[PDB]
């Protein structure tokens, strides 16, 4: 078969696969199937002016509307400055992914108008909103009293912030993943947990992800994988967002609180949406073992947590930087720059000419197909260390081995290991097809030996 290193790569690449199979006794839905499920009501805002974008205005009410007392909500109160600040960050997180804009101001001859306000009567629930096809479209209300103080101090990572994002989701036309004393047992599909959608009532533990432990609470502040697909299906994707080179995680340049990390103890939970450019997922500040997958629509285990980071469908992220732990880095079809950092890492460049950095420690560079590194577009290991690092080709040779020679003899399996002293450039040429010419090339910065190759 193959090496254990490859098996780990393959295992993680499929770990979160969705669709056409049962999970927890429930059908597994793909992102696209969930996009339809979340928009099953048919309600949405309409582009009245036909300008290609939903232009909405919103007001933080300062006085109760006509007929307010009849709602049975109790004492009315306006949003505090803190609530306003957080509400704007939630609105922004939705506008980043879909062609919808939110401007503070009174209703004008706009595609729609939204209102935000608090109430004190618990019988009204923690918070609620109306769909855009109702007579109270645009409205969202939040409970605040001595017994329920969650909405008084919303902040990145807490339920107060997710509540704002979730309720705004409803005003945009999103429903709950199912028609919800109900429990996850009543879910229509397996992925109905807040690891996939902030619209879900169920915790990520139901699907096996680990974000935090008892006593502590961690919630995604922004739209997750399935939410992004659902809102883009309704209003279209916003390709203008972060269309230039962007860095997420440590040393972030995304300018979003939920995409930024500054400490090894940070709890990241986000889905990456990016419009274009050369982008990097920098998770160098973590010391826990991580598993980073650059495949669009896939999940990664970051900062000691599992399934907490994902890349939205239709997004191509080019680079990833691991941490001081023993990480797995899986690239995509594009030319990627992958850095494992300290620790013994397993790196998989995939298609395209990748630039690989193993960093310190004993690192393994895995190859699953000849097309992964061809003479045309060959990979390069900028810091290979003979005797410590390894080039794994077992997925191709199936442990069949290679025949190291000085010149191709025309027999399949022939491999050539060359080096340049006054250049420190190494190279591994292989002829798998056996046509007398190399069909697989891997260049390195540093000397490579026959014993550094696993096949
Ligand atoms: Ca419009
Ligand atoms: Ca970008
Ligand atoms: Ca990109
Ligand atoms: Ca590492
Ligand atoms: Ca690649
Ligand atoms: Ca390393
Ligand atoms: Ca490659
Ligand atoms: Zn809801």
Automatic annotation (TrEMBL):
Binding site for Ca(2+) 9: 350, 352, 354, 372, 379
Superkingdom in the source lineage: Bacteria
Residues involved in Ca(2+) 5 binding: 323, 325, 327, 340, 342, 345
GO BP term, example: proteolysis
Binding site for Ca(2+) 7: 341, 343, 345, 358, 360, 363
UniProt-annotated binding residues for Ca(2+) 4: 277, 279, 316, 318
Residues the record lists as binding Zn(2+): 166-167, 170, 176
GO cellular component, one term: extracellular matrix
Domain Peptidase metallopeptidase: 54-213
Record-listed E.C. numbers: 3.4.24.40
Keywords in alphabetical order: Calcium, Hydrolase, Metal-binding, Metalloprotease, Protease, Repeat, Secreted, Zinc
GO molecular function: calcium ion binding; metalloendopeptidase activity; zinc ion binding
Gene3D superfamilies in the cross-refs: Collagenase (Catalytic Domain) (3.40.390.10), Serralysin-like metalloprotease, C-terminal (2.150.10.10)
Alphabetical list of NCBIfam families matching this protein: Zn_serralysin
UniProt family annotation: Belongs to the peptidase M10B family.
Name of the protein in its database record: Serralysin
Species the sequence originates in: Pseudomonas sp. 'TAC II 18'
Organism taxonomic ancestry: Bacteria, Pseudomonadati, Pseudomonadota, Gammaproteobacteria, Pseudomonadales
């Amino acid at each position: 078969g193959t090496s254990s290193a490859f098996t780990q790569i393959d295992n993680f690449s499929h770990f979160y696969d969705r669709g056409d199979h049962l999970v927890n006794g429930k059908p597994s839905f793909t992102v696209d199937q969930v996009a339809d499920q979340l928009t099953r009501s048919g309600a949405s805002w309409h582009d009245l002016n036909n300008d290609g974008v939903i232009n909405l205005t919103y007001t933080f009410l300062t006085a109760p509307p006509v007929g307010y007392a009849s709602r049975g909500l109790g004492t009315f109160s306006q949003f505090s400055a803190l609530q306003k600040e957080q509400a704007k960050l939630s609105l922004e997180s939705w506008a980043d992914v879909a062609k919808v804009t939110f401007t503070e101001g009174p209703a004008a001859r706009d595609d729609g108008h939204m209102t935000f306000a608090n109430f004190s009567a618990s019988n009204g629930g923690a918070a609620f909103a109306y769909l855009p096809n109702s007579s109270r479209k645009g409205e969202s209300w939040y409970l605040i009293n001595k017994d329920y103080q969650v909405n008084k101090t919303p902040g990145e990572g807490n339920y107060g912030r997710q509540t704002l994002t979730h309720e705004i989701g409803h005003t945009l036309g999103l429903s709950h993943p199912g028609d919800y004393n109900p429990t996850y047992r009543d879910a229509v599909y397996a992925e109905d947990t807040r690891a996939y959608s902030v619209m879900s009532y169920w915790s990520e533990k139901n699907t096996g992800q680990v974000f935090t432990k008892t006593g502590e609470g961690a919630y995604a502040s922004a739209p997750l994988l399935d939410d992004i697909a659902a809102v883009q299906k309704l209003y279209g994707a916003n390709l203008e967002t972060r269309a230039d080179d962007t860095v997420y995680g440590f040393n972030s340049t995304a300018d979003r609180d939920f995409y930024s990390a500054t400490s090894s103890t940070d709890k990241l939970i986000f889905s990456v949406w990016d419009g274009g450019g050369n982008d990097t997922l920098d998770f160098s500040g973590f010391s826990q073992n991580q598993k980073i997958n650059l495949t669009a629509g896939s999940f990664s285990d970051v900062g000691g947590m599992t399934g907490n980071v994902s890349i939205a469908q239709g997004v191509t992220i080019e680079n990833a930087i691991g941490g001081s732990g023993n990480d797995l880095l899986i690239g995509n079809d594009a030319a990627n720059v992958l850095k494992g950092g300290a620790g013994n890492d397993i790196i998989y460049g995939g298609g395209g000419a990748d630039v690989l950095w193993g960093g310190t420690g004993s690192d393994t560079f895995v190859f699953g197909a000849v097309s992964d590194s061809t003479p045309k577009a060959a990979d390069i290991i900028k810091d290979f260390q003979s005797g410590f690092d390894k080039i794994d080709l077992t997925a191709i040779t199936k442990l069949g081995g290679l025949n190291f020679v000085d010149a191709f003899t025309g027999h399949a399996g022939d491999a050539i290991v060359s080096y340049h002293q006054a250049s420190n450039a190494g190279s591994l040429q292989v002829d798998f097809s056996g046509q007398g010419v190399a069909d697989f090339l891997v260049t390195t910065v540093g000397q490579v030996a026959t014993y550094d190759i696993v096949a």
